Every structure is written in C-alpha cells, then in structure tokens.
Amino acid sequence: AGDPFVDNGTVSSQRPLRAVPGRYPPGATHLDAAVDTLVRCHAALGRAPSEAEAAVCLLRRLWGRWGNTPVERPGWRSYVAVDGSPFELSAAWNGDGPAEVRVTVEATADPPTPEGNQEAGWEYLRGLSRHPGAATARVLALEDLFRPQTPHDRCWIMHGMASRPGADPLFKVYLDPDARGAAEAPSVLDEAMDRLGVRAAWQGLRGWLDEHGGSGRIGSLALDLADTDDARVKVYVQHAGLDWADIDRQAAVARGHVPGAFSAALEEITGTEVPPHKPPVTCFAFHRGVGVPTAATLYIPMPAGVPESDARRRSAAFMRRSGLDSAAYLAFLAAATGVRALQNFVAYRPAAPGGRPRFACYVAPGLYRL
C-alpha cells in the first residue's frame, strides 16, 4: 500500500506538487537540476572535479532517458526525495577522508502511470546490465516477484549510483516490499531472501524480532549490484511504537552491535520530548553464507517540534562527537538544497572493534514546496 509517512504517486488535487519559483530556469528538467546539484555537492565536499564530471556522465547515461522531465508542473510525486523530486542527493562518511556522494533516482514514464513507471524502473536495470561495473543478475532474478501484472498506485523502485573517491562507482537498487500489496509483503520478502541465498539469516532475524518488540513495517529490500565480497542484501525495518532503548536492544542480533550507541544517537538528535513524524528505521545487512545479519545501521528521523536549523545543529554536533566531519555535512546540505526540512533521515553505524564510525545524510533538492 506504500509508505504512510512519505507520499508518492500521481499528482492531482489530492496530491499537489508546486515548483519553488527561484530554483531552475523555465524549461529546466529534473536531470538539469540533478547534474547541477551533483557538481555543486562534489565541490562542497572537496571531491575531485574530475570525479564529479564522471558522476554526471554516469547519471546521464543511466537515467537520462527518464530524468529529462520538466521541473515545472510534474505529473508524478516521487518517493525517493521528501519534496517529491525524482532524485535525492546523499553523502556518506565512513571514518576519515572524503565523503562518498550518491544520487538515488526514480525512472518515471511519459505520461507517468503505475504501469508505465514500473516498466521504466525495470528497463533501467536492463540498461544497467550493459555497464561493466554492475552485476544485475540477482535483481533481475526477482522481477517476477516485484513487477506484477497490476502495480499498486504508489509503486516505486529506486536506483542508486555511488561516486567514491579514487574508486569505481557502485550501484544499488531499492525494492518495494508492498509490490503485491500489504498482505503479500511477508511472503514476497521471504521468497526474495530465499532467492538471494540468505533465508536462514532472514528467518533468524524474523524470530529475533518477534521476541524483541516486534518486526515493524518492512520499508525496503535493497541490493548492492556488485559481484564482490563487499556486496550485501539489506532490509529496512521501520520501528513503530518502540522506545529508543528497545530499538538499540533489537540491533543486538547483528554483528558489530555496540550496546547503547543507537539509543544515544536517538536521544541526541530525535530527542525524547515529542514522537518524531515518522519512526526510526534499522537497516540490517546480510551476506550469503553468514547466518546472522552482518551489520545494523540506524536511520534517525529529525526531531519534531524543533526548527530544521536546530535539527541540523544537533546532527552536526552528533557527527563531531563521533569524530566525523560535520563541516562537510553542513556544506553538503547547503549545496544540495540551493531553513527547509529537506532531509530524509540521517544514518549512523557505530564503530565496532577494529572498525570506523559511519554517518550519512539524505537530502531532497528542494525543487517543490513541502
């Protein structure tokens, strides 16, 4: 049935979408905005301009077919960005060094319809299968599960491209557990994890969740589209009605768990005064041949009842206190948005022994009024 907290689907009087006047010129396309933003975001992070150009070339190659839609009077509200734009910029810090820059996109049809959009989203993967650095076999093996006869009205599939400092790009896909409806979501996930060779670990997680506050809504199944030992399967669990201590304890099922770290992050950012507008999410990672989740990353919502400026102040302060580059985070937010609540979540994984702390941001371009 779709995400209850972030709207997406056909634009109409019931789902209006209005361009902010002072952003891109009349006639500008989403791809125009994304290219400009991608460049400015690389610069704000001190990344090599050559790598930014490579990122732009890659985005045009893979998404240009669908992303050259007009910013003005869009026919579809996308899920990928909180303002409804069909692209979202993200920066990720894994310990020290230059941040990874990611863009996540949705491919819409002309005109945008559920069936058209699902066709486009899966046609994107066929195009991606021609790219030497992509491994699309594992996701195309799931197409019959996630691409039914009649998609639901709020269908989505999202595609990520990561630009890494001094390294080859990484590709990711995000799939909708609700593709065949809410009722079918558990069986769709069970079957997908079977096909991906991580059934035991998944069912182990299910059993664990049943005893630790419950498995809230599964928000997404994501795959790293690489043929490497680093590639993972990822499941995003949204935690309605759980307190911060319980979310922390729930993560103990995963390797690398650091008791107390999740609860502290939630207290420092989301706060304990007002429930957030949407619940936190834990992303559990899986690897074929490992019987438990290999990692857990917390997705932290911005605090309710507090201005966005304070949300950014808290998030930056939390970053600093983890030894990460908060200045880069603030610069990236400015570059990506051109005051406005355009963040999605902020992601955090504490450093396990021998490891590095991780923090990531996810920011809409602010093309549309909230």
Numbering used by the authors: 2 to 339, 344 to 375
From the paper:
Heterologous expression in Streptomyces lividans TK21 and an in vivo analysis revealed that TleC catalyses the ‘reverse' prenylation of the cyclic dipeptide (−)-indolactam V (1) at the C-7 position of the indole ring with geranyl pyrophosphate (GPP) (C10) to produce lyngbyatoxin A (2), with the C19R configuration, as in the case of LtxC15. MpnD also catalyses the ‘reverse' prenylation of 1 at the C-7 position, with DMAPP (C5) to yield pendolmycin (3). The overall structures of TleC and MpnD adopt the ABBA-fold, which consists of ten antiparallel β-strands assembled into a circular β-barrel, surrounded by a ring of solvent-exposed α-helices, as observed in the structures of indole PTs and aromatic PTs222324252627. In contrast to typical indole PTs that exhibit broad substrate specificities towards the prenyl acceptors but with strict specificities towards the prenyl donors, it is remarkable that the indolactam-specific TleC and MpnD exhibited unusually relaxed substrate specificities towards the prenyl donors and accepted different chain lengths (from C5 to C25) of prenyl pyrophosphate in vitro.
To understand the intimate structural details of the enzyme reactions, we solved the X-ray crystal structures of TleC and MpnD as the apo structures (at 2.0 and 1.6 Å resolutions, respectively) and the ternary complexes with (−)-indolactam V and a DMAPP analogue dimethylallyl S-thiophosphate (DMSPP) (at 2.1 and 1.4 Å resolutions, respectively). Furthermore, the overall structures of TleC and MpnD are highly homologous to each other, with a root mean square deviation (RMSD) of 1.9 Å for the Cα-atoms. MpnD is also quite similar to these enzymes, with RMSD values of 2.9, 3.0 and 2.8 Å, respectively. In contrast, MpnD showed 109-fold higher activity for the C5 over the C10. In contrast, the rotation of the corresponding Tyr80 was not observed in the MpnD structures, because of the steric hindrance between Tyr80 and Met159. Moreover, the significant conformational differences of the loop between residues 166–174 in TleC and 152–160 in MpnD (RMSD of 1.9 Å for the Cα atoms), and the lack of a residue between 157 and 159 in MpnD (170 and 173 in TleC), result in the displacement of the Cα atom of the active site forming residue Met159 in MpnD by 1.3 Å towards the inside of the active site, as compared with Ala173 in TleC.
